[PDB]
Each structure stands twice: as C-alpha cells, then as structure tokens.
Ligand binder design. Structure first.
Ligand code: MH0
Ligand code: NPO
Length: 137
C-alpha cells in the first residue's frame, strides 16, 4: 500500500525522483517556464546536470517525508504551510502540483510493480486541497 510505496521509492530515490520529474516535464513541457536551465536538454543530459539531480532528489526527499507524516494520504497542515510559504514556491499555483502528481501516478501505473496508484492519486488531491487551504492560488 501507500506506506510500503514510500519505502520502495526511498530505496532507489535518486532514480525514481529523476524518472518521475522527467515524466512530468515530458508530459507537460510548458512546465519548463519554471525551469529555464532545463530547456533544450534530453533526459540523459539532465541526469548529467548537478542541480537537476540534487534539486530533484531533495524535492522527493521532502515529498517522502510529507507522505510518511500523512494519515490515510492526508498531509499535515504544517507540511502544506511549509510548501506554500517556501520562497522557492513564490511563483506557483496548485495546478503545478496537480500535474506533478498526475505524472507520478501515470509512472506508477506503467511500472510492473504493485504501487498503490489510487493512494498516490488521493495523496496528490489531498495535498492540492491542503495547499489551497494554506493559501496557495
Ligand atoms: C513544477 C512546480 C513545482 C512543484 C510541483 C514542486 C513540488 C514540490 N517541491 Fe518544489 N516544486 C516546484 C517548484 C520548485 C522550484 C521552481 C524550486 C526552486 C529550485 C529549482 O528550480 O531547482 C523548488 N521547487 C525547490 C524545492 C526544494 C529545494 C530544492 C533545492 O534547492 O535543492 C524543495 C525541498 C522542494 N522544492 C520541495 C517540494 C516538494 C516536497 C514538492 C512536492 C509536494
Ligand atoms: O519534482 N519537482 O517538482 C522538482 C524537481 C526539481 C526541481 O529543481 C524543482 C522541483
């Protein structure tokens, strides 16, 4: 289920994190207006770029913490607040987050592995709800 999936992703997180983020950028190429320095690069070229690997892993490190702290795929309001208040998130709207979770669930459904994709869809929806409640446009 969802808690086991957190353990699965954590056991190979740099790889999963880069593969899901690449799935997101390829499904939604207009999302690169928040990643100017990732324009005009193939997947293998991005996985050679220091900030790509390090920023994407740090993102998924904290995503796994928020998922781990959730009850029944509902995040803590302290975590949603952190994600809204972060200077790094100044530009963003809830639809940026919805698109990331769409890509993440599609990734999971394509894997041969027994991911609980319905739980990840609920999590993404619940995080979007929480971000809206914590003041994200
Ligand atoms: C597509 C929009 C977008 C979404 C969705 C998004 C979703 C998430 N984020 Fe977060 N984040 C986005 C846009 C950014 C930007 C633009 C930056 C700045 C750093 C950069 O460009 O590498 C950033 N996020 C930076 C970060 C950083 C700091 C990275 C670093 O500087 O090394 C963390 C920890 C982070 N986020 C957390 C999270 C978490 C957790 C989620 C999932 C709930
Ligand atoms: O997965 N994400 O949403 C990310 C990935 C990398 C990054 O630099 C910022 C956000």
């Amino acid at each position: 289920g969802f808690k086991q999936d957190i353990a699965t992703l954590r056991g190979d997180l740099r790889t999963y994190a880069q593969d899901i983020f690449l799935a997101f950028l390829n499904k939604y190429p207009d999302e690169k207006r928040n990643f100017k320095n990732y324009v005009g690069k193939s997947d293998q070229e991005l996985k050679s770029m220091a900030k790509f690997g390090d920023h994407t892993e740090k993102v998924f490190n904290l995503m796994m913490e928020v998922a781990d702290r959730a009850t029944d795929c509902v995040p803590l309001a302290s975590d949603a607040s952190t994600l809204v208040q972060m200077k790094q998130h100044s530009g963003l709207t809830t639809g940026n987050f919805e698109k990331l979770f769409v890509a993440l669930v599609e990734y999971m459904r394509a894997s041969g592995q027994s991911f609980d994709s319905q739980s990840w869809d609920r999590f993404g929806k619940n995080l979007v709800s929480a971000l809206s409640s914590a003041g994200m446009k």
